[PDB]
DNA sequence: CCCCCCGGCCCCCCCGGC
C-alpha cells in the first residue's frame, strides 16, 4: 500500500517530533495569523519543509487544507504557444510550480498569480478569532529554480495585493533567490533532524509496521547514511526490509540508489585511467545519466564529493578539484549545456590528477 | 457642459464629414469660436492638407462661449460617430480647459439618450493660414465623374497627370501594363446644370500627383455634387468640396518634376 | 537660402563605359559587351562606392539607346521586391513584347540584390530560363554570397576590387579641372588616404572642403574628414608601453566623444585583422577583448573597463 | 504645458537659435557658412549624450524655413516606427513630392538612426541618392558601429565633442543671469568637474541645487551645497581614504574608510571612480602597479554593478590596492 | 455566501507591518532629506523635473514616489494623473511606443474645484516605470524622444536598483536621486517608533543590533522586528527581547561555531575541514552570512599580518561574487574555507 | 435581397556578424 514515508507523514504541528525550538516559532507565527508576512522556508532537502508548511496552514485553517484537488490551467505565449500548468488546489491554498514552465515560468506569476491576488475573499471563511479570513495562501514549491524574470514579477505583487494573498516559497537554498524577494519574506531555517531523531521515528515505523530488528545499531547505520535526508532515510527503511523478508539483521547491506553507483563507477575510472579515451568514454556515461533526468548540479556535486573521499589522492589534488569544481559550478549556473561544463571539469580534474 | 455646446439636427452630417478626411489624417485640432468650426491637418508625409470649415448656419444652435481647441484622433471619433443612428441629434459640448469632449446622441419619439466620452490629445501645431493665390487655371465637375476618371487611372499607374490648356482638360496615366487618357471638355446643361464641366484657363497647367493621395481626396465626393479644382504652376493643387455652410479644401503638393 | 547646388558624385556620375575608372579589364568587357551584344546574365559585386549602379546603368544605356525607357525594368531595395512582385510584375516585363534592333535585349536591373528574400530568388529561376531568349538580367550586390547557387550557376561574374589611389587622384584632377579648384598636392594625398579606395567618398570631401574652407589642402581637408578611428585603435594596440596605450585611449579616443562599445567593436576588428602579431596572441586578445565587450553590454561602460582591457592586453604580451 | 517656467530647465534652456549653441563652434561655423552659401550636403552627426546634436539639428531646421519649419521638415526618431515599410512608403513620397507651403528643398531628420534596422537603412541608400536633387538627409547618432557603411559612405560627417570647460562656464552664467542666483567659483568648479562635458547634467544639478537653499535670492552655492545635493564624496574624503589605505594599517584603513563613508552615506563605487582618477596622475615605477590595480578595481566595479555584499567589496579595494602598491619596492 | 466589506484603517491594522507602517506623506520618510527636500520644494515651484530613483533594497524609493504623488494631486486625482508600470506588466518596444506614448500625449485630466483649492494640482502627469532596469535597451531607446517632446504635459520616474541597466541617454535626461542605505545611525528614530506603537519591549541596543543585521534594508529589519514581537507576545512571559534571540531569528551563526570552523582552518587538515564542512551544512546555514561573519572577524583582527589580510580579502571577494551568481553553497564553502586555510 | 470584390486582423515561418 501506500509506503511509510507517506503513511505516517505528520498532520499537525503537534505531531512534530523534531526541531521543537522550529515547532515552538511556527506555533507562535500561528497564534495571530492576520498578519501573518510572507514566508520563505529555507533548508537541507529532505527534512520536512512542505510538511511544516502544511502543519502551519492547518493550524491557521484546519484540517480542510489537506483536501486537495488537482486542476490545469492553460497559457498562451507570445508566439502563440499553448502551455498546460498543473495547479494543486485546496478550499483554502494554492500551490504552483511554476518552473514547470521553465523560461515562460514569468507568465505564471504575470497571469495566474496577479488573478488570484487582485481578487478579494468573500466565502465566510470562520476562523478562531470569530471572523472570517481575509487571504488565500500561496505555495510556489522549488523557488530556488525561478528565473530571475519572474523573480522581478513577484515584487511589487506581494506589496500592492498583501491583503488578500499571503506567499510561502519552499527552497532548499537562498543562493539563486534575488535579494529584493528576500527583502520581502520572512527568511525561516529548516535545519535536518539528528541521528538520534531519525532513529526515534524509524523505530517508531518498525513498531508500527511490525519489523523484527535484530539490533537498534541498523537504525542508526541508516540514519548515518542518509546524511540528514529524512525521506531518504525512511525509503531505505522500507527498502531494507523488502528484500530481507521484512526481517531486518545487522549485517542487512546498505543499499544505493543506482546513479551513485554509476557516479562512483565513474568516480574511479577517472582516478584510475587518466586519458582522452577514458575522457570519451566517460562522455558517455554522463550523457546517460543527463538522459534519465538526473540534474546536472547533483551529478556534479556528487563526483566532486565522491572525488575528494578517495584515499590514493593527496592533498594538492583534492585542493585542485575543489577548485575546478568551484569553477565549474559557477559556469553551469551561467550556462545552458551543462554537458560542456562537466565535460571540462572532468578534463581539468584529469589533468590535475595525471 | 456649459462653455461649447453644437447641435446637429442629424448626425450624418458630421459622420459624413468626418468620413470624407479620416483617411488621410489621424490627429486633428478643432477650434471652435463664435464663428463656427475651424480645423486644418497635416498628413503623416507632409504631402497632403486637409482644411475643414464649418459655420454657425450649419448648426440647430450653437454656443461657444470663448475660443476653445480641442484635439482629437479621427479613428476613435469616427468609432464613437458609427454609434448613433441617423435619426438622432447630436450634441457636441465641451467646458472650461477641458479635457474629454462629450457626444450625445438623442432621440425625442423614443426618448432614448446615449452619451460617448472622448478623450482629447495635447497637439501642439499653429493654424498656419493659408494665404489666398490667384491660380492659372480654375475649373469645376461633378464628384462623381472625378471620382470614376481617379479610379480608372489608378489601376493603370501610381501617378497620374493633369493638362489643363485651352479648353481641354487632359488625365494621363502611363504604367507596366499600358496607359491610359481621359479628355474632357467645358460644357454647359441648361436642362440639367448640375452636370456642366466649368473651366476657366489663363495659363497651361501641367502638374503630376500621386494616385493614393487622389484616391483618399476624391473619398469627400459624398459631402458634395461637384468638386471645385485650382491648379498652378507654383502651388499646391486645391481641390474644394462646398458643405450648405462651410467647406471642405485639400492642398496637395505636386511630385517634382524630374 | 532655399537653393541647394548638385552634388558632384550626380553631376559628374559617368554617363559612359570609357568614364569609369578601375577595373580596366571588367569594363573593356563590358564595353565589348556593349559593341557586339547578347548580353548574358551578369552579377556584379563589390565594395560601395566603386562603380558598380554606374556601370550597369551605362551599359543598359548603350545597349539600348532610345528604348531605355521601355526596355530597362529596374528594382532596387527601396522598391517592393517581394515574390509576388516577381511572379507578376517581372513575369510581365519578361514576356511583353518589345521590338528591339537586332541583337539586343531587355534587361531587368536588380539593384542590391543582396537583400532580396530566398524565394524571390528562387521564384527567379525558371524566370530567368524560360525567357532569356527576349530578356537578361544583370544583378548588382554588396556580398555574392548572399545569391543563391542556382541563380550565381544562370549568371557570369563580375568582381570589383578597391580602386587605386592612381585612378582616384586621376578622377579628382579632372574634377578639379572641370570645377577651376584650388589645391595642394598634400590635400589630395590627405584626401585619397581618408577615401580609403571609396570614390563617392572622396568626391564628397572634396566638395565638402571647397564649399566650407575653399582651398584643399591637408588641414583644411583634416578639418573636415576627421582621421579614420581605426587607425588610431590599431596604434593604441600596438603600442609598447602600457602608459602609451593608455595615453592614446585618454587623448585621442576618450575625450574626443568616441563611445565605448564603438572603440571595443573597432578593437576586436583590428586584432582580428593584425597579421603582424601571431594568430594565438591575437586569439587570446580577441577573448580580453570579448571579455570586455560583454561587460560593456551589460551597462557598464566606464574608462576603468578599457584601461583594464589595455592593460591585460599588454600583460598577454608580456 | 502652462507656462515655460514649469518645464524642467533641461528643456526650459534648449537653444532655439544656432547662437545659443556653445562649445560646437566649428561644426556651428561650418553648417552655417554651408547654408549661407546654399549647399548642403547630407549630413551626419556623430556624438555622445548631450552635446547639442538634436538642438543644432532644430535650429539650422529652424533659421532655414523660419518658425512654420515643423511644418516643412520629415522628423523620425526611435519613438516612431521606422520599419522598411515606412522608408518605403512615408519617406518616399515626401522625398519625392514638392513643398506645400513654400519651393524650397526638403529636410528629412532621422535622430536616434542607430536604432533603425538594417533592412530600412540599406532601402534608404537609394532614397538618398535618386532625390538628392531636391532632397536632404540628417542622421543623428551616439553609436556608429550601428550604422551600415553604406549609409556613412553617403553622408559628410561631424563629431560633436565633449562640451568643453568655456563653455559649460558660460551656459552657467546665462542661467544664473536668468534665475537671479550665485554660485560660488569652487561651486562652479565642482559642477564643471561631475559633468563630464554633458550639459543636461550641469542643469539638472544646479536646479536640485536652487531647491536646496533655503532662500535661493540670498544664498549662493556652495560646494557644500553640490556635494551634498548630489550626494558624492569630496575630494578631501578621497584624498583622506587613500592616505589611509596606502600609509596605514589595515584596521586603521578599515575604520577610515567606514567612517568617512558613513559620514554622510557615501557610494563605495564613487570613491573608487574618484580613487582612479587620483592615481591616474601618479608616476609609478613599476607597469605591474598599475595593470593589478586597473584589473582588479574593474573587476570590484563590475561585481558591484550587480549587487553583493558592500562591506566585502570595500575590504577587497583596500587589500587590492594595499597589493598593487607592493610591488613599487621590488 | 459573501462577507461584508472592510475599512480602509480597519483593513490596515491588520496588514504586515512593513505595509503597515509605509509612510504615507514626503515628512515620514526617515533618511533621504537630501532627495526629499527637492522633491518637497517642488510643490510650490512646480517644475518637476524627470526623476531616475536608485539605491539599494528597502530605502524608500516606492514609498517616496507614492508619497510625492499623493500630495501632489491628492487622493482623488492621483489616479488620473498616475499611470505606473513595473516588472510584472508588459513593457516592450511595442507598449512603449504606443501605450506609454499615448498616454504622455493625453491631455492632463481636468482638476475638480476642491482639488485645486486643497492640492497644489501642478499641469503635467506623471508616469512610473519602477523596476526599469529590467526593461530592454530598444525599449529604453523609444523613450528618449518621448521623455523631452511631450515634457510640457507629462513626467517620467524611473525607479531602478541596478543604474548601470539604464542606457546612457535616458540617465543623462533624468535627474539622478540616490537612496543611501539606512543604517543603525539615520533609521533608528523610525524603528524606535514603530516599536512603541506597537508596545514592543525589548533591551537596550536590540533595535541597533536589528539595523545593524538588517545591513541597509529597513524592510528586513521591521519584519524581523515583527517576529520578534510576535515570538515574545506567544511566549507571554512579559521579558524584554534579548539581543540573542533576534540573532537566532536572524540566521546568525553562533560565534562558538564561527570559533570552531576557525580553529578547524588553523588546523589546516583537509580531511577534518570537510567532515566538519558537512556536518555544518546540515543545519541550513546561509553561506553569504557565514562569508559576512568571517570577513568581520578576519579582517578585524590584530592577530594576522597584512599580506594574510590582502590574500582573505581577495578570497573573500571571489567567494561573495561567486555566490552571488546561484551557485551550490556547499562547493563555494568548502573552497573558500580550504583556500583560507593554505594561506 | 444577395453575390463579388478587395482591403484589413490574425497567424506562422524564417533571420539575427560583417
Ligand atoms: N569607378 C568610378 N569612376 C568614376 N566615378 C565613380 C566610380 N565609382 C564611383 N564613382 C562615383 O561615385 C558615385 C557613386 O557610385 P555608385 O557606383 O553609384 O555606388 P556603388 O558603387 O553602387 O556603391 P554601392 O555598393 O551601391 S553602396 C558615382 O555617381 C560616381 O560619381
Ligand atoms: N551645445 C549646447 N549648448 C547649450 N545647451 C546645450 C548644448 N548641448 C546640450 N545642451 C542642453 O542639453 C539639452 C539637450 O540637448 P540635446 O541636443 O537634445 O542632447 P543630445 O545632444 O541630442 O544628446 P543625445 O545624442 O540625443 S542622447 C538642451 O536642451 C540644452 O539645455
Ligand atoms: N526611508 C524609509 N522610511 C520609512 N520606511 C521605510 C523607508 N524605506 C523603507 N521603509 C519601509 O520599508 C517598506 C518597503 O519600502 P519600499 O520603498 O517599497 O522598498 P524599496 O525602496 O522600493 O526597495 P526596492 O528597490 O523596491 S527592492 C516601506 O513600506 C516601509 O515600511
Ligand atoms: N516531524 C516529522 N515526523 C515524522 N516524519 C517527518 C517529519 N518531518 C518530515 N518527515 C518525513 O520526511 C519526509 C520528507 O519531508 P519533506 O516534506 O520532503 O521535507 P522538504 O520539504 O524539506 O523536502 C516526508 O515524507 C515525511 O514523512
Ligand atoms: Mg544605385
Ligand atoms: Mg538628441
Ligand atoms: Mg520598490
Given at each position: 500500500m501506500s ?7 505528520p498532520?499537525?504541528l503537534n505531531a512534530?517530533?523534531?526541531?521543537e525550538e522550529?515547532?515552538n516559532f ?6 495571530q ?6 514566508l520563505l522556508?529555507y533548508?537541507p ?11 502551519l ?6 484540517p ?5 484537488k488537482?486542476?490545469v490551467r ?9 502551455l ?8 483554502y ?14 507568465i ?17 471563511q470562520?476562523?478562531?478569532?470569530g471572523?472570517?479570513h481575509?487571504?488565500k ?16 514579477a513577484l515584487?511589487?505583487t506581494m506589496?500592492?495585493?498583501?491583503k488578500?494573498?499571503?506567499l510561502?516559497?519552499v527552497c ?6 534575488i ?12 535545519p ?5 531523531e531519525?532513529?526515534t ?7 508500527n ?6 539490533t537498534?545499531?541498523i ?16 525509503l531505505?527503511?522500507?527498502?531494507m526490509?523488502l ?10 547491506p546498505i543499499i ?6 554509476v557516479?562512483?563507477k565513474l568516480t574511479?575510472?577517472?582516478?584510475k ?7 570519451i568514454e566517460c562522455r558517455?556515461?554522463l550523457?546517460d545519466?543527463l538522459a ?16 575528494l ?6 592533498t594538492?589534488?583534492?585542493?585542485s578539484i575543489?577548485?575546478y569544481?568551484?569553477?565549474f559550478?559557477?559556469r ?7 554537458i ?5 571539469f ?9 | 457642459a456649459?462653455?461649447?455646446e453644437?447641435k446637429f439636427?442629424?448626425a ?5 464629414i468626418?468620413?470624407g478626411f ?15 468650426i ?5 498628413d ?6 486637409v482644411?475643414?470649415e464649418?459655420?454657425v448656419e ?8 470663448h ?5 482629437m484622433?479621427?479613428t ?8 448613433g443612428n441617423?435619426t ?6 465641451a467646458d ?9 446622441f438623442?432621440?425625442?419619439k ?11 490629445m495635447?497637439?501642439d501645431?499653429?493654424?498656419l493660414?493659408?494665404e489666398?493665390?490667384?491660380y492659372?487655371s480654375t475649373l ?14 489608378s ?9 489643363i490648356?485651352?479648353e481641354?482638360?487632359?488625365?494621363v496615366a502611363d ?6 487618357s ?5 460644357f ?7 452636370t456642366?464641366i466649368k ?9 503630376t500627383?500621386?494616385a493614393?493621395?487622389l ?18 504652376s507654383?502651388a ?16 496637395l ?6 | 537660402?532655399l537653393s541647394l547646388?548638385?552634388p558632384?558624385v550626380?553631376?559628374?556620375?559617368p554617363?559612359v563605359?570609357?568614364?569609369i ?6 569594363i573593356d568587357?563590358?564595353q565589348?559587351?556593349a559593341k557586339?551584344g ?14 558598380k549602379t554606374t ?8 545597349l539600348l539607346?532610345?528604348?531605355y525607357?521601355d526596355?530597362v ?12 512582385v516577381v ?7 519578361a ?7 537586332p541583337g ?10 543582396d537583400?532580396?528574400?530566398a524565394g524571390?530568388?528562387?521564384?527567379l529561376?525558371?524566370?530567368m ?12 550586390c554588396?556580398?555574392?554570397?548572399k ?5 550565381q550557376?544562370?549568371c557570369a ?16 584632377l579632372?574634377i578639379?579641372?572641370?570645377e577651376?579648384?584650388?589645391?595642394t598636392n598634400?590635400?589630395?594625398?590627405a ?5 580609403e ?5 572622396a568626391i ?10 575653399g582651398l ?11 582621421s579614420?578611428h581605426?587607425?588610431?585603435?590599431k596604434?593604441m594596440?600596438l ?6 596605450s ?7 579616443l ?6 565605448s562599445?564603438?572603440i571595443?567593436?573597432?578593437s576586436?576588428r583590428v ?14 586578445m580577441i ?6 565587450h560583454?561587460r560593456?553590454?551589460?551597462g557598464?561602460?566606464?574608462?576603468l573597463?578599457?584601461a583594464s582591457?589595455?592593460?591585460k ?6 | ?8 530647465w ?14 560646437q563652434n566649428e561644426?556651428?561655423?561650418?553648417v552655417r ?8 550636403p547630407?549630413?551626419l ?18 533659421e532655414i524655413?523660419?518658425?512654420n519649419?515643423?511644418?516643412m521638415?520629415?522628423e523620425?526618431?526611435?519613438?516612431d516606427?521606422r520599419?522598411?515599410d ?11 513630392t ?7 528643398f ?5 535622430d536616434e538612426?542607430?536604432?533603425?534596422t ?9 532614397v ?24 556613412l559612405?553617403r553622408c559628410?560627417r ?5 562640451l ?8 552657467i ?10 554660485l560660488?567659483?569652487?561651486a562652479?568648479?565642482?559642477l564643471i568637474?561631475?559633468?563630464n562635458?554633458d ?8 536646479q ?8 535661493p ?9 553640490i556635494?551634498?545635493?548630489?550626494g558624492?564624496?569630496?575630494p ?12 596605514d594599517?589595515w584596521?586603521?584603513a578599515?575604520?577610515?574608510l ?6 554622510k552615506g ?7 571612480e ?9 608616476e ?7 595593470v593589478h590595480?586597473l584589473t ?11 549587487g553583493g555584499?558592500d ?7 583596500i587589500?587590492?590596492?594595499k ?7 621590488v | 455566501?459573501?462577507i ?5 484603517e ?12 509605509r ?12 532627495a ?6 517642488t510643490l510650490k515651484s512646480?517644475?518637476?523635473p ?7 533594497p528597502?530605502?524608500?524609493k516606492?514609498?517616496?514616489?507614492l508619497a510625492?504623488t499623493?500630495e501632489?494631486?491628492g487622493?482623488?486625482?492621483m489616479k488620473?494623473?498616475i ?10 518596444i ?6 506609454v ?22 499641469p503635467?502627469?506623471?508616469?512610473i516605470?519602477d523596476?526599469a ?13 518621448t ?7 507629462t ?11 539604464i542606457?546612457d541617454?535616458?540617465?543623462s ?23 512603541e ?21 529597513l ?5 524581523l522586528?515583527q ?5 515574545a ?14 540573532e537566532?531569528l ?6 562558538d561555531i564561527?570559533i570552531?570552523?576557525?580553529?578547524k582552518?588553523?588546523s589546516?587538515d583537509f580531511?577534518?575541514i ?9 543545519s541550513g546555514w546561509?553561506?553569504a ?7 568581520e ?6 592577530n594576522?599580518?597584512?599580506?594574510f589580510?590582502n590574500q ?7 567567494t ?9 553553497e ?13 594561506l
Open positions: 509506503l511509510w514515508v507517506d503513511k505516517y507523514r498532520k499537525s512534530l517530533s523534531h526541531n522550529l515547532t511556527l506555533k507562535s507565527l500561528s497564534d495569523p492576520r498578519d501573518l508576512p510572507h522556508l533548508g532537502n529532505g527534512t520536512g519543509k512542505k510538511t511544516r508548511c502544511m502543519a496552514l492547518e493550524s491557521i485553517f484546519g480542510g487544507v489537506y483536501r486537495l488537482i486542476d492553460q497559457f498562451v505565449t507570445a508566439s502563440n504557444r499553448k498546460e500548468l498543473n495547479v494543486v488546489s485546496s478550499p491554498h494554492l500551490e504552483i510550480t511554476p518552473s514547470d514552465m521553465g523560461n515562460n515560468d514569468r505564471v506569476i504575470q497571469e495566474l498569480l496577479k488573478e488570484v491576488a487582485q481578487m478579494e475573499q468573500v466565502d465566510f470562520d476562523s478562531k478569532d471572523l472570517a481575509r487571504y495562501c500561496v505555495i510556489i514549491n522549488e523557488a530556488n529554480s525561478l528565473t530571475k524574470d519572474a523573480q522581478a515584487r511589487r506589496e500592492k495585493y498583501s488578500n494573498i499571503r510561502i516559497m532548499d537554498s537562498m543562493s539563486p533567490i535579494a529584493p524577494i528576500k527583502s520581502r519574506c520572512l527568511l525561516i531555517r529548516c535536518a533532524p539528528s541521528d538520534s531519525i532513529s521515528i524509524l523505530s517508531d515505523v518498525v513498531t509496521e511490525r519489523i523484527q530488528l535484530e537498534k545499531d537504525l542508526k547505520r541508516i540514519a548515518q547514511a542518509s546524511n540528514g535526508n529524512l525521506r531518504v532515510s525512511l531505505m527503511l522500507e527498502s526490509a528484500n530481507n523478508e521484512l526481517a531486518l539483521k545487522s549485517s542487512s544505493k540508489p543506482d546513479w551513485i553507483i557516479i562512483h574511479r575510472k577517472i582516478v585511467e587518466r586519458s582522452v579515451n577514458s575522457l558517455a556515461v550523457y545519466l534519465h533526468c538526473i540534474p546536472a548540479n547533483i551529478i556534479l556535486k556528487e563526483l566532486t564529493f565522491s572525488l573521499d578517495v584515499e590514493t589522492l593527496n594538492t589534488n583534492k585542493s575543489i577548485e569544481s568551484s569553477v559550478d559557477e553551469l549556473s551561467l550556462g545552458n549545456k551543462a560542456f561544463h562537466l565535460e571540462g572532468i578534463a581539468k580534474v584529469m589533468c590535475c590528477l595525471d | 456649459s462653455m461649447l453644437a439636427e442629424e450624418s452630417l458630421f459622420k459624413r468626418i468620413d479620416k483617411d488621410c489624417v489621424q490627429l486633428v485640432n478643432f477650434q471652435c469660436k463664435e464663428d463656427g475651424i480645423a486644418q491637418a497635416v503623416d508625409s507632409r504631402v497632403l492638407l482644411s475643414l464649418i459655420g450649419a448648426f440647430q444652435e450653437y454656443r461657444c462661449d475660443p476653445v481647441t480641442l484635439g484622433d479621427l476613435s471619433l469616427s468609432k464613437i460617430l458609427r454609434c441617423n438622432d441629434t447630436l450634441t457636441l459640448i472650461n480647459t477641458p479635457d474629454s469632449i462629450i457626444l450625445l438623442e432621440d425625442t423614443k426618448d432614448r439618450i446615449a452619451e460617448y466620452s472622448l478623450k482629447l495635447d497637439i501645431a499653429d493654424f493660414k493659408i489666398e493665390l490667384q492659372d469645376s465637375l461633378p464628384s462623381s465623374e472625378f471620382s470614376k476618371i481617379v479610379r480608372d487611372l489601376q493603370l499607374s501610381d501617378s497620374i497627370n493633369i493638362m490648356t485651352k481641354t482638360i487632359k488625365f504604367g507596366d501594363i499600358g496607359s491610359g481621359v479628355i474632357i471638355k467645358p454647359v446643361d441648361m436642362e440639367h446644370p448640375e456642366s473651366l476657366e484657363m489663363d495659363q497651361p497647367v501641367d502638374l500627383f500621386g493614393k493621395y484616391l483618399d481626396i476624391i473619398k469627400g465626393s459624398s459631402l458634395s455634387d461637384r468638386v471645385g479644382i485650382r491648379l498652378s507654383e499646391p493643387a486645391l481641390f474644394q468640396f462646398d458643405l450648405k455652410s462651410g467647406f471642405l479644401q485639400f492642398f503638393a505636386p511630385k517634382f518634376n524630374d | 537660402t547646388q548638385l558632384w550626380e553631376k559628374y556620375r554617363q563605359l570609357s568614364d575608372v578601375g577595373n580596366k579589364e571588367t568587357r563590358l565589348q559587351i557586339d547578347n548580353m548574358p546574365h551578369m552579377i556584379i559585386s563589390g565594395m560601395p562606392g566603386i562603380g556601370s550597369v546603368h551605362c551599359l543598359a544605356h548603350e539607346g532610345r528604348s525607357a526596355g525594368l529596374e528594382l532596387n531595395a527601396s522598391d517592393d521586391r517581394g515574390i509576388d511572379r507578376n510584375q517581372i513575369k510581365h516585363f514576356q511583353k513584347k518589345l521590338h528591339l534592333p539586343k535585349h531587355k534587361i531587368v536591373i536588380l539593384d542590391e540584390a537583400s532580396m528574400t524571390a530568388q528562387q521564384a529561376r525558371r524566370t530560363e524560360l525567357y532569356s531568349n527576349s530578356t537578361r538580367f544583370a544583378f548588382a554588396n556580398q555574392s554570397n545569391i543563391i547557387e542556382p541563380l550557376s544562370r561574374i563580375l568582381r570589383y576590387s578597391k580602386l587605386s589611389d592612381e585612378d582616384v587622384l586621376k578622377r579628382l579632372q578639379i579641372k572641370l577651376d579648384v584650388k589645391y598634400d590635400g589630395l594625398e584626401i585619397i588616404f581618408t577615401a579606395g571609396d570614390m563617392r567618398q564628397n570631401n572634396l566638395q565638402s572642403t571647397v564649399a566650407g574652407h584643399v589642402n591637408a588641414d583644411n581637408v583634416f578639418k573636415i574628414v576627421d579614420p581605426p587607425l588610431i585603435v596604434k594596440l603600442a609598447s608601453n602600457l602608459e602609451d593608455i595615453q592614446i585611449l585618454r587623448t585621442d576618450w575625450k574626443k566623444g568616441y563611445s562599445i564603438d571595443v567593436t573597432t576586436f586584432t582580428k585583422n593584425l597579421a603582424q602579431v601571431k594568430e594565438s596572441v591575437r586569439l587570446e577573448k580580453e577583448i570579448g571579455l570586455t560583454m560593456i553590454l551589460e557598464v561602460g566606464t574608462y573597463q578599457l582591457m589595455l592593460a592586453i599588454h600583460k598577454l604580451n608580456n | 504645458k502652462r507656462s515655460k517656467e514649469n518645464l524642467p533641461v528643456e526650459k534652456y534648449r537653444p532655439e537659435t544656432l547662437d545659443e549653441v556653445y562649445g561644426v556651428i561655423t561650418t557658412k554651408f547654408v549661407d552659401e546654399g549647399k548642403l547630407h549630413l552627426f556623430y556624438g555622445p549624450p548631450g552635446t547639442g546634436k538634436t538642438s543644432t539639428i532644430v535650429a539650422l531646421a529652424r524655413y523660419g518658425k519649419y515643423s511644418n521638415v520629415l523620425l526618431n526611435a519613438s516606427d520599419g522598411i515606412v522608408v518605403r512608403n512615408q519617406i518616399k513620397d515626401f522625398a519625392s514638392r513643398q506645400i507651403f513654400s519651393k524650397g526638403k529636410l528629412i531628420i532621422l538612426a542607430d536604432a533603425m538594417n533592412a530600412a537603412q540599406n532601402a534608404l541608400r537609394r538618398i541618392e535618386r532625390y538628392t536633387k531636391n532632397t536632404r538627409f540628417c542622421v543623428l547618432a551616439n553609436y556608429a558601429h550601428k550604422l551600415t557603411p553604406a549609409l559612405s559628410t561631424f563629431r560633436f565633442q565633449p568643453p570647460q568655456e563653455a559649460i562656464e558660460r551656459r552664467a546665462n542661467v544664473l543671469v536668468h534665475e537671479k542666483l550665485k560660488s567659483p569652487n562652479e568648479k565642482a568637474e561631475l559633468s562635458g550639459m543636461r547634467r550641469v542643469l539638472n544639478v544646479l536640485s541645487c536652487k531647491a536646496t537653499l533655503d532662500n535670492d540670498e544664498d549662493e552655492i556652495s560646494d557644500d551645497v556635494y551634498e545635493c548630489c558624492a564624496p569630496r578631501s574624503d578621497l584624498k583622506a581614504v587613500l592616505k589611509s589605505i596606502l600609509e594599517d584596521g586603521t578599515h575604520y577610515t567606514n567612517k568617512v563613508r558613513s559620514a557615501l557610494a563605495l563605487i564613487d570613491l573608487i574618484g580613487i582612479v582618477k587620483i592615481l591616474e596622475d601618479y609609478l615605477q613599476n607597469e605591474e602597479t598599475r590595480l582588479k578595481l574593474a573587476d570590484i566595479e563590475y561585481s558591484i554593478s550587480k555584499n562591506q566585502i567589496q570595500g575590504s577587497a579595494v587589500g587590492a590596492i597589493a598593487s602598491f607592493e610591488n613599487e619596492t | 455566501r459573501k461584508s466589506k472592510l475599512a480602509a480597519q483593513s490596515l491594522a491588520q496588514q504586515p507591518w512593513v505595509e503597515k507602517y509612510p504615507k506623506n514626503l515628512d515620514e520618510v526617515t533618511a533621504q532629506d537630501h526629499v527636500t527637492v522633491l518637497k520644494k512646480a517644475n518637476l524627470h526623476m531616475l530613483f536608485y539605491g539599494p528597502g530605502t524608500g516606492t514609498s517616496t514616489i510625492l499623493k501632489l494631486y487622493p482623488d486625482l488620473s494623473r499611470l505606473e508600470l513595473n516588472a510584472s506588466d508588459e513593457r516592450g511595442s507598449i512603449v511606443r504606443e501605450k506614448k499615448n498616454f504622455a500625449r493625453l491631455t492632463v485630466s481636468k482638476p475638480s474645484k476642491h482639488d485645486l483649492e486643497n492640492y497644489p494640482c501642478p503635467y502627469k506623471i508616469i516605470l523596476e532596469d529590467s526593461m530592454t535597451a530598444d525599449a529604453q531607446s523609444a523613450l528618449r524622444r521623455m523631452e517632446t511631450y515634457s510640457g504635459v513626467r517620467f520616474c524611473l525607479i531602478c536598483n541596478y543604474v548601470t541597466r542606457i541617454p535616458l540617465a535626461r533624468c535627474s539622478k536621486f540616490r537612496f543611501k542605505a539606512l543604517d543603525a545611525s539615520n533609521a533608528i528614530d523610525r524603528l524606535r517608533f514603530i516599536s506603537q506597537e508596545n514592543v519591549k525589548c533591551d537596550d541596543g536590540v533595535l541597533e543590533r536589528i539595523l545593524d543585521i538588517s545591513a541597509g534594508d524592510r528586513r529589519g521591521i519584519t522586528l517576529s520578534a514581537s510576535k515570538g507576545q506567544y511566549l507571554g512571559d512579559g521579558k524584554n527581547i534579548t539581543s540573542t534571540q533576534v537566532e536572524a540566521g546568525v551563526v553562533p560565534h564561527l570552531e570552523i576557525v580553529e582552518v588553523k589546516g580531511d577534518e570537510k567532515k566538519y564542512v558537512n556536518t555544518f551544512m546540515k546561509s553561506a552570512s557565514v562569508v559576512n561573519q568571517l570577513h572577524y578576519y579582517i578585524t583582527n590584530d594576522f599580518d597584512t599580506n589580510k582573505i580579502s581577495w578570497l573573500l571577494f571571489t561573495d561574487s561567486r555566490l552571488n551568481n546561484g551557485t551550490n556547499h562547493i563555494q564553502l568548502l573552497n573558500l574555507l580550504v583556500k583560507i586555510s593554505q
